[PDB]
Design a protein around this nucleic acid. Structure first.
Lengths: 100, 228, 142, 312, 67
RNA sequence: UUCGAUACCAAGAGCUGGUGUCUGAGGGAUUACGACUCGCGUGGUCGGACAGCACAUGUUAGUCAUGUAUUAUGGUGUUUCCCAACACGUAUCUU
RNA sequence: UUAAUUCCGAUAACGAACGAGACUCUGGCAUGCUAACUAGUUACGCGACCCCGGUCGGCGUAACUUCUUAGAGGGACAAG
């Protein structure tokens, strides 16, 4: 019953709508929900030179890429939450349903 | 997956995956009006969508090139059979797609149309399609050995700030001619549609509007329209 | 007796200190140790300043634990001197006459405002072409 | 005869917007201000200060607009600009229940005679009914005010379950509470209204706006009784609880009237002039009599509550 | 260095020109009416316009403000 | 020193709030149906109203449409899933 | 006058567009809100040591979100 749905996404409002959708689906299917626990955002940071040559003033580019991680833990037999999580998928987020 | 790599390495892996896929499909579908890619990795599906203008040329004669492209996709990137499914579709109002318009100009120059006539023909189509403001600048050697830069511009075009990231669509391409290379930069400012189909749904941050006060008339004597 | 506890925090920099006020006798302790064994000893009176302003009579009824983390030595001492001062004021606003709270708050905020209000200053980020925030590398001509 | 000052209640940072009195306690008044705190006072009427603040009720995010005390004398209800209500036990001043549902600022809120019905008029164009157990009971959205819902008020006459609501759209609407359906529209006011009250009789209603015209209204028929000339903007309106008087806060002064013969009983304006050097006088925004009607308490917009006692 | 730009002044002058009936001398009242009447996409610019409205209308009361 | 209001209790009520039966007035999804595309399998797009229906089947109107089974351009019954009375409905049970 | 062709003033100019600004990220604030066994706290039961208390990043499970985390709004505008 104790099953772990984690959502890893680069875009935030996408992830938030998926987090909302799984709470909606859970409270409708009448099963105990642990709310969307927000793990710290990881900021992948790469900083390079701008110029292809080396005949300019030393200006650097600061490239960032945030990656967000939510998880909701439910008390439900595999099936009903599997069919809840088989609907309403968008390209931004990525799903993991963990049983044990 | 027992290889069990970091979410950090997983997302940069997915980043380079789309980047090369796009490079390969822009190199392949170059002449046949190619707009871009999209991936939807569903549970055990890699639904890999392509956006083009001339989709009949790219999906070919009874799906020869589609199964050819699906084969090289599964063969190179190392995918399972049945799981990978390509879907070529037509992009709406091509007039606003900077990729499609830049490659259209490039292939009118490859045909051998006049340079001012090529640019004004493109820029006129961009504007009648409903671009709030357009910008076409083709650079390189014309009529001689010294390099020139022709700029063709009309309407309202923003350069600085954040709104550039969701109002201005830009694309840069190279055209091979017999004397050297010319560069093509197409730069289109999209109009505002609240639906978010044709352009964005955020109005410009400085642009402020007022709804007109409804023309009322003040009463003089107290009234009541009592009911039950 | 029932609960008469208020957990109240004091920050001066990265450092933070959560004072746990409670009913009882007069004891003040930081990570187990008492006040007068928290080094550096140079800033001894910085921890005592709330005590020596208000006397030990106002702390007769309260026994304030403090747990501290982050920052360095001087930041941590300024975090905890702020925390216990807010913790007593928050206790006297919940369980005692507000006339008492008002009198204590006026006594402190006149001596030093840094007791109740946090210092909003944070170490500024470095920019390239320089060894710090604003400093730039030595430019050479000829 | 005339009213006169004994002293002032100095215990606010942001300026006082509402005052609330209960019939049970004489030495307990509740002032809501434009900080986030409701100050529950202890009136002594000593030579030094008329009252000292004994409790401050914290929990609100934005300005507490409204406050009202229950029949029992234990519960108070306040409404703030955050768009939620708070239900306080005056004992310790910790919140019992918070009411959630509205989107924009909740501008006022009123109890029943029973304390079993609560009503909130808000800046979002709605009135909403509230139980005392945190439940969104009924919205009224379609047949409502075309501008903000400035105020709503319940009546002491318990025989006719009616509510009076003054808006910004130059109306006074009246709803059959059991139906929560429109009974009478009241057109007549030129411009928006601040305040509406019901005379302790449950007989005749007042209405005040920027126009400076205090128009009386009938709860029995749908008929305009008569009008008074405020002169300045009316921000506050309430009747004397025992006497047949109406008191209005005409911006920087109080104008109190006898209702049978329309003449000024007296006008109350600060005579200790501090704003005499190119400064506009700070203006009264709420007033309410005691349970007895001996003392009128008036809250100003320079963080002060003044006392007005009958010299006769 | 607090000089308001054309977008603040123009839009504030237009709101004073039309809706003089509701606007006042209090900042937070006319901030809310300005948010209601006018579609301003950012919150900083909303506070800037409301702030100018309740400075011009504090001088309309004084005398012959020009613009 | 008379007369009518005011704290009190009781005699049931009424009110009010809580509980919760039942129905779907409605509100959803895609799985009906449609359309537009084809690699002929689908992929999009309507998403319950916009499809269909069989003379089956409720209500009937212009009596004149018609060339009087008839069909008007009745225009609403039938029914495939789901959440649902802030639709303050109100069964019971309290206050 | 402003950081600014930033504005209000004079004014045959009026109304506008690019750049400035606005914008995005960021820093500081919430004892208000949604949440937490990959974060804690407070109380508790137990265990160890000093003379009822004291210490514990020693052990363990009912409340709660002050401290940590990251979402939604709020807040500041030369406004008094």
């Amino acid at each position: 019953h104790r099953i772990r749905i984690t959502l890893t996404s680069r875009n935030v409002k996408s992830l938030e709508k998926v987090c909302a959708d799984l709470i909606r689906g859970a409270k409708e299917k009448n099963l105990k929900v642990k709310g969307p626990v927000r793990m710290p955002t990881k900021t992948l940071r790469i900083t390079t030179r701008k110029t292809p040559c080396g005949e300019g003033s030393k200006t650097w580019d600061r490239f960032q890429m945030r990656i967000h991680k939510r998880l909701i833990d439910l008390h439900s037999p595999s099936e009903i939450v599997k069919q809840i999580t088989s609907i309403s998928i968008e390209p931004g987020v990525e799903v993991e349903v963990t049983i044990a | 997956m027992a290889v069990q790599i970091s979410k950090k390495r997983k997302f940069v892996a997915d980043g380079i995956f789309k980047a090369e896929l796009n490079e390969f499909l822009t190199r392949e579908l170059a002449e046949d009006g190619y707009s871009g890619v999209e991936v939807r990795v569903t549970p055990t599906r890699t639904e890999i969508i392509i956006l083009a203008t001339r989709t009949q040329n790219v999906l070919g004669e009874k799906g020869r090139r589609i199964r050819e492209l699906t084969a090289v996709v599964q063969k190179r990137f190392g995918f399972p059979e049945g799981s990978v499914e390509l879907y070529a579709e037509k992009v709406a109002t091509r007039g606003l797609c900077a990729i499609a318009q830049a490659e259209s100009l490039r292939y009118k120059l490859l045909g051998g149309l006049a340079v001012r006539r090529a640019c004004y023909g493109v820029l006129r189509f961009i504007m009648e399609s409903g671009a709030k403001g357009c910008e076409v600048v083709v650079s390189g050697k014309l009529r001689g050995q010294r390099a020139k830069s022709m700029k063709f511009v009309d309407g309202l075009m923003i350069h600085s700030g954040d709104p550039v990231n969701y109002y201005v669509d830009t694309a840069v391409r190279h055209v091979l001619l017999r004397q050297g290379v010319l560069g093509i930069k197409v730069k289109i400012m999209l109009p505002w549609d609240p639906s978010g189909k044709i352009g964005p749904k955020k109005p410009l941050p400085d642009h402020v509007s007022i709804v007109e006060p409804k023309d009322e008339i003040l009463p003089t004597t107290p009234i009541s329209e009592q009911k039950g | 007796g029932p609960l008469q506890s208020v957990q109240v925090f004091g920050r001066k920099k990265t450092a933070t200190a959560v004072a746990h006020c409670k009913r009882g006798n007069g004891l003040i302790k930081v990570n187990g140790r008492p006040l007068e064994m928290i080094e550096p000893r140079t800033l001894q009176y910085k921890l005592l300043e709330p005590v020596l302003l208000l006397g030990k009579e106002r702390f007769a009824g309260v026994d304030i634990r403090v747990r501290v983390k982050g920052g360095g030595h001087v930041a941590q001492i300024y975090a905890i001197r702020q925390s216990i001062s807010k913790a007593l004021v928050a206790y006297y606003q919940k369980y005692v006459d507000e006339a008492s709270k008002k009198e204590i708050k006026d006594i402190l905020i006149q001596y030093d405002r840094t007791l109740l209000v946090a210092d909003p200053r944070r170490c500024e980020s470095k920019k390239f072409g320089g060894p710090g925030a604003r400093a730039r590398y030595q430019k050479s001509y000829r | 005869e005339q009213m006169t000052l004994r002293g002032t209640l100095k215990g606010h940072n942001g300026w006082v917007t509402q005052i609330a009195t209960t019939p049970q306690f004489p030495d307990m008044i509740l002032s809501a201000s434009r900080d986030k705190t409701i100050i529950m006072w202890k009136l002594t009427r000593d030579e030094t200060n008329y009252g000292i603040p004994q409790r401050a009720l914290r929990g609100h995010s934005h300005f507490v607009s409204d406050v009202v005390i229950s029949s029992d004398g234990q519960f108070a209800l306040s409404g703030s600009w955050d768009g939620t209500l708070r239900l306080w036990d005056l004992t310790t001043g910790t919140t019992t229940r918070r009411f959630v549902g509205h989107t924009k600022d909740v501008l006022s809120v009123a109890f029943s005679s029973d304390n079993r019905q609560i009503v909130s008029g808000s800046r979002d164009k709605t009135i909403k009914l509230w139980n005392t157990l945190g439940v969104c009971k009924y919205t009224v959205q379609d047949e409502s005010h075309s501008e903000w819902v400035s105020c709503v008020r319940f009546s002491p006459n318990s025989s006719n379950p009616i509510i009076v609501s003054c808006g910004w759209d130059k109306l006074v609407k009246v709803w059959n509470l059991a139906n929560c359906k429109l009974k009478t529209n009241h057109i007549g006011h030129t411009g928006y209204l601040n305040t509406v009250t019901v005379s302790p009789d449950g007989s005749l209603c007042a209405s005040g706006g920027k126009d400076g015209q205090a128009m009386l209204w009938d709860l029995n028929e749908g008929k305009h009784l008569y009008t008074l000339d405020g002169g300045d903007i009316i921000n506050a309106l309430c009747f004397s609880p025992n006497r047949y008087w109406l008191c209005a806060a005409t911006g920087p002064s109080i104008k109190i009237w006898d209702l049978e013969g329309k003449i000024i009983v007296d006008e109350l304006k600060q005579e200790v002039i501090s704003t005499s050097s190119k400064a506009e006088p700070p203006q009264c925004t709420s007033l309410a009599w005691s349970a007895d009607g001996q003392t009128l308490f008036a809250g100003y917009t320079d963080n002060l509550v003044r006392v007005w006692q009958v010299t006769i | 260095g607090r000089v308001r730009t054309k977008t603040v002044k123009k839009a504030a002058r237009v709101i004073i020109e039309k809706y003089y009936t509701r606007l006042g001398n209090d900042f937070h009242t006319n901030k809310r009416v300005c948010e209601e009447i006018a579609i301003i996409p950012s919150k900083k610019l909303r506070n800037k316009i409301a702030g100018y409205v309740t400075h011009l209308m504090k001088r309309i009361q004084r005398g012959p403000v020009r613009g």
